[PDB]
Motif scaffolding. Structure first.
Motif, PDB file in Angstrom:
ATOM      1  N   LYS A 248       0.845  -1.229   0.000  1.00 48.16           N
ATOM      2  CA  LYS A 248       0.000   0.000   0.000  1.00 48.16           C
ATOM      3  C   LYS A 248       0.802   1.167   0.000  1.00 48.16           C
ATOM      4  N   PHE A 249       1.700   1.401   1.005  1.00 46.12           N
ATOM      5  CA  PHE A 249       2.646   2.501   0.995  1.00 46.12           C
ATOM      6  C   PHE A 249       3.973   1.886   0.852  1.00 46.12           C
ATOM      7  N   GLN A 250       4.899   2.648   0.217  1.00 48.61           N
ATOM      8  CA  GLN A 250       6.241   2.258  -0.109  1.00 48.61           C
ATOM      9  C   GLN A 250       7.028   3.461  -0.634  1.00 48.61           C
ATOM     10  N   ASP A 251       8.073   3.804   0.133  1.00 50.80           N
ATOM     11  CA  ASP A 251       8.926   4.914  -0.326  1.00 50.80           C
ATOM     12  C   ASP A 251      10.373   4.383  -0.314  1.00 50.80           C
ATOM     13  N   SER A 252      10.583   3.196  -0.928  1.00 50.57           N
ATOM     14  CA  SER A 252      11.813   2.454  -1.097  1.00 50.57           C
ATOM     15  C   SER A 252      12.329   2.053   0.287  1.00 50.57           C
ATOM     16  N   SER A 253      11.432   1.619   1.194  1.00 49.85           N
ATOM     17  CA  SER A 253      11.782   1.225   2.553  1.00 49.85           C
ATOM     18  C   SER A 253      10.864   0.050   2.823  1.00 49.85           C
ATOM     19  N   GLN A 254      10.625  -0.681   1.675  1.00 51.45           N
ATOM     20  CA  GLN A 254       9.824  -1.874   1.664  1.00 51.45           C
ATOM     21  C   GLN A 254      10.703  -2.745   0.804  1.00 51.45           C
ATOM     22  N   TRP A 255      10.590  -4.037   1.150  1.00 51.07           N
ATOM     23  CA  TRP A 255      11.425  -5.105   0.622  1.00 51.07           C
ATOM     24  C   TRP A 255      10.851  -6.480   0.769  1.00 51.07           C
ATOM     25  N   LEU A 256      11.563  -7.494   0.138  1.00 48.64           N
ATOM     26  CA  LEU A 256      11.028  -8.779   0.292  1.00 48.64           C
ATOM     27  C   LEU A 256      12.202  -9.549   0.789  1.00 48.64           C
ATOM     28  N   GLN A 257      12.079 -10.466   1.836  1.00 52.40           N
ATOM     29  CA  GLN A 257      13.297 -11.180   2.388  1.00 52.40           C
ATOM     30  C   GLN A 257      13.027 -12.594   2.218  1.00 52.40           C
ATOM     31  N   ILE A 258      14.178 -13.333   2.029  1.00 55.73           N
ATOM     32  CA  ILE A 258      14.115 -14.724   1.886  1.00 55.73           C
ATOM     33  C   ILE A 258      14.929 -15.167   3.092  1.00 55.73           C
ATOM     34  N   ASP A 259      14.211 -15.918   3.920  1.00 61.26           N
ATOM     35  CA  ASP A 259      14.844 -16.454   5.161  1.00 61.26           C
ATOM     36  C   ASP A 259      15.121 -17.863   4.776  1.00 61.26           C
ATOM     37  N   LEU A 260      16.422 -18.185   4.462  1.00 62.34           N
ATOM     38  CA  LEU A 260      16.870 -19.527   4.145  1.00 62.34           C
ATOM     39  C   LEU A 260      17.121 -20.429   5.300  1.00 62.34           C
ATOM     40  N   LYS A 261      17.456 -19.861   6.469  1.00 64.84           N
ATOM     41  CA  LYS A 261      17.757 -20.586   7.680  1.00 64.84           C
ATOM     42  C   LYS A 261      18.827 -21.571   7.499  1.00 64.84           C
ATOM     43  N   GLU A 262      19.768 -21.272   6.630  1.00 62.35           N
ATOM     44  CA  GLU A 262      20.973 -22.064   6.319  1.00 62.35           C
ATOM     45  C   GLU A 262      21.720 -21.165   5.414  1.00 62.35           C
ATOM     46  N   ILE A 263      23.041 -20.972   5.636  1.00 62.53           N
ATOM     47  CA  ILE A 263      23.875 -20.192   4.790  1.00 62.53           C
ATOM     48  C   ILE A 263      24.045 -20.926   3.519  1.00 62.53           C
ATOM     49  N   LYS A 264      23.572 -20.375   2.408  1.00 64.49           N
ATOM     50  CA  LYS A 264      23.566 -21.016   1.079  1.00 64.49           C
ATOM     51  C   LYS A 264      24.273 -20.104   0.140  1.00 64.49           C
ATOM     52  N   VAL A 265      24.640 -20.686  -1.031  1.00 70.78           N
ATOM     53  CA  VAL A 265      25.369 -19.910  -2.050  1.00 70.78           C
ATOM     54  C   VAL A 265      24.392 -19.700  -3.170  1.00 70.78           C
ATOM     55  N   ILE A 266      24.112 -18.358  -3.300  1.00 68.74           N
ATOM     56  CA  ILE A 266      23.148 -17.798  -4.218  1.00 68.74           C
ATOM     57  C   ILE A 266      23.922 -17.328  -5.388  1.00 68.74           C
ATOM     58  N   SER A 267      23.535 -17.748  -6.591  1.00 71.50           N
ATOM     59  CA  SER A 267      24.212 -17.250  -7.821  1.00 71.50           C
ATOM     60  C   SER A 267      23.321 -16.206  -8.621  1.00 71.50           C
ATOM     61  N   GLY A 268      22.006 -16.076  -8.359  1.00 72.21           N
ATOM     62  CA  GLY A 268      21.270 -15.054  -9.133  1.00 72.21           C
ATOM     63  C   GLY A 268      19.979 -14.791  -8.492  1.00 72.21           C
TER      64      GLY A 268
END
Lengths: 167, 167, 167, 167, 167, 167, 167, 167
Positions: B58-78
């Motif tokens: 609804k409101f967003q002034d670039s202080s909104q985001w989406l998080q991915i909680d992996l709960k394990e340190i993983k290696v992300i390539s993209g």
């Protein structure tokens, strides 16, 4: 086998805050001649901000510096410097000194015939300058002296090392 | 031996739905200021559609985001981002943050001297933009902040990793 | 070591008839809306003919498909499609979907940034179009959707895999 | 390790006569419609002559062929065809079929996208045409169908395989 | 490992006289139609002379030959032919046949598509022509047929093999 | 592994005098028709001089030679010839023969198609001509025949072999 | 493995004085015809000076020389010659002879077809000429004969060998 | 395996002060003819200053030098020389001598045919000239003689070695 180049740099952790505040030593032990003791060492870290950026220095005639006491001889591959955020500060130069063991005296960074080099500071504030150091720096106690000043010196920094690591 | 490039990417599973809905965390924990709590996390997944595409804000002034909680340190390539399907949304930028351990603070994605980079959003809706991240991202908790907005932000995403796997 | 390219393709066996008729599943389970239940699955196989070529489809608005139920996750390297022989049928497109485990949902074939691709059908009947799929398809249940139709769809097919085999 | 190319071909033995006459099967089991049963299988062998060259065929509308029953799945690298010597016979085409196990049905020789190929016959009689088959043919029962005819078909042949052998 | 090329040729021994006279078999077993039985087999050897060079042949219409009975399957890498010394004899051609085991029938030398080749004889007498045979000849009983004749045929010869040997 | 080229030549020893005088055999066993028996074999050695250079030959119509009896099959890599010093002698040719075992008969040096070669003698006296023999000569009894003569023949020589030796 | 080139030369020691004076043998054993017995062998060493440079020779018609008695067969890679310092002496030539074992006779240095070579002396006094000898000299007793003379001969020298040594 | 080049130089420690003052030996043992005994050896070290730079020399006619007594045969890869800081001193030349064992006599640095070389001094004071020595110097007692003088000689120095070290 032998040290490589590297292929990737390992930040020590000033942004992550792996380094303890107790390992960021500021020149002027009186802290009332070359510091106000506010801004604190925690502000003087790469991308640390929100209530003061950098460390301050009241007087400074290129005989003020910031030291990183590692308390372990480590292999440093680069020096990141970032500007402050209060008011502008123009490019300076750096003298890179290091000492191992916490014994004898200090020695200078060498780069080719002529045997020395100074690195560029931050041209315009709040921006990071990546000064990679080609040979591996064997250091336990690092002294980064900023030479020259636009009013005063105030840098934020993080060190780069190298862990292979490999997966 | 050491991490390769890669040669092939391994999607985590947002389209396959390997990721649990409980690992897609949306900004605004009130969910009535930066979300309507409909569209759900299951809609905010690559090629998930048919009853709403993306998550809303609804409101967003670039202080909104989406998080991915992996709960394990993983290696992300993209990071794959796909537009919504309700109404058009124009290109945005991304700030890639990550934190390991679920301890200390967050750090920024670096790419060369200058030490940062923002990635392009979706130019025209309902299309996927493939933002591959050249160095391997060691992350446990990923925060993708969309910077800029055409009315509001609403992206669908899936992460790429790398498993060798070899046959 | 790791999967190669390949160097040679291994047909599963639709011409040889290694595949059982029970593994060729046709859309329309009523088989009276999108099929006449004649032509049978055995006719819908590469170079199978003499009494009907392909499978038929009475109604089809690109929501009819042919599935190969492998009942084992196998590595598919290509999709062969051959035209019918009753009357002409012009080029169509294909959507390649696959699912492993016979669990979760289905996912799409990806090919580069943009993350999808459709393959060309048979331009003129009774001829085979060799659509090799560059990355290895990890699939247990394959769904080949023909998009577009010249009156109706009716293809004959065989899959290519890869066995090293070596001698 | 893996099959090579080869570097040298191994003739099975039709000139040497390693093959038994009992393994050269001629179409027309009546042998009075598509054969005269004279010329015999022993004449239908590469460089066999002096009393008739080739096998004969009274009627033939490209539904006559010559089969080699190996009774062991062998790896065939080429098909040698030689003309007759009674009277001239012009170039024909070949359809190469093979079946393994002596089970299921027969399958076709493939060569690239399009998945088939026919090989050239003997342009002018009493001369050998070397049709090497690039991929290795896994066959137990070989069927060479001559397509087209200058009056009738009548070829002499020997197969090439590959044994490494090495010395 | 595998046969090489070679790098050096090993003469069997016709000049050295390693071969027994009993292994040089001449056509015409009557020896009064295609020979005079003088000149003997010992004269029909490379660089053997002083009392007659070569073997003679009274009648010959290219159905006379000289055979080397090795009585062991050996690998022949070349055929040396040398002219006579009594009176001139012009270039002829050779048909190279060989048989292994001393069983079945004889087979022809092959060289590329077309599967045969004849080698050049001696242009002007008392000179050696080096006809190297590129593929290794697996032979136990060698038949060298001279085709064409300037009055009659009369050659001197030695075979080349290959022993690695290495030092 | 296998004989090399070489990289360095090993003189047998005619200058060093490793060879015994008893191994230098001169043609004309009467030694009063093709020799004066003065100059002796010790003079007929590379760089041996001071009281006569070479061996002499009273009569010689290219049926005089000098033999080296090695009494062991050795591998000879070259033939050094040096002129006399009494009076001038012009270039001659050489026929290189060798025999192993001290059995059978003698055979000729071969060099390419044509299978023979003669080597150049000494153009002007008291100078050494280095005739290296590309293939390794397997010889026990060496016969160097000088062909042609400026009055008579009279050469001094030493053989080159090859010992790896390596250090 | 095998002798290398080298990569570095090892001086024996004439400047260092590793060689004993007893191993520098001068021609003229009377030492009153081709020497004055002053200057001594210790002066006749590379860069030895201050009281006489070189060895002297009263009479010399290129039948005077300087020998190095190694008393062990060693591998010599070069001959250093340096001029005297009393008065000028112009370039000479050298004949390099060597003998092993201290048995048989002496042999000459060879360099290519022609089998000999002389090396250049010292053009102008008190300067060193580096004559490296490409093949390894197997010598126990070295004889360096100076050919030609500007009044008399008088050289200073040191030998170069090769020890790998490696670190 | 064998000494490398290197890839990196190891300073012994004159700046670090690894070397004891007792190992820096100055010419003139009277120290009142070619020295004032002030400036001390500790000042005569690379980048040592603040109370006198270099060692002094009252009289000097290129028969004054500075020696480094290592008391262990070490491998020296370079000689660093730095100017004084009291008053200007112009470029000089160096003669590099070394002796091992502390026995025999001294020998000279060699560099190619001609077998010697002198290195450049400091052009303008208070600056370091990097004279790397290509071959490895095997030395226990080093003598650096400065040749030529602008009034007197006064250099500061540090040696470079090589330790692989590898990480």
């Amino acid at each position: 086998d032998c040290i490589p180049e590297c292929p990737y740099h390992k930040p020590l952790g000033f942004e992550s805050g792996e380094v303890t505040p107790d390992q960021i030593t500021c020149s002027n032990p009186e802290q009332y001649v070359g510091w106000y003791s506010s801004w604190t060492a925690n502000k003087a870290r790469l991308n640390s901000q929100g209530f003061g950026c950098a460390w301050l220095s009241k007087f400074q005639d290129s005989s003020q510096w910031l030291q990183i006491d590692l308390k372990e001889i480590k292999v440093i591959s680069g020096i990141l410097t970032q500007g402050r955020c209060d008011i502008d500060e123009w490019m300076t130069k750096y003298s890179v000194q290091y000492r191992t063991d916490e014994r004898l005296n200090w020695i200078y960074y060498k780069d080719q015939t002529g045997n020395n080099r100074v690195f560029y500071g931050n041209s315009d504030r709040t921006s990071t300058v990546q000064n990679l150091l080609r040979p591996p720096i064997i250091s336990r106690f690092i002294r980064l002296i900023p030479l020259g000043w636009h009013v005063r010196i105030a840098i934020r920094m993080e060190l780069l090392e190298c862990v292979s690591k490999c997966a």
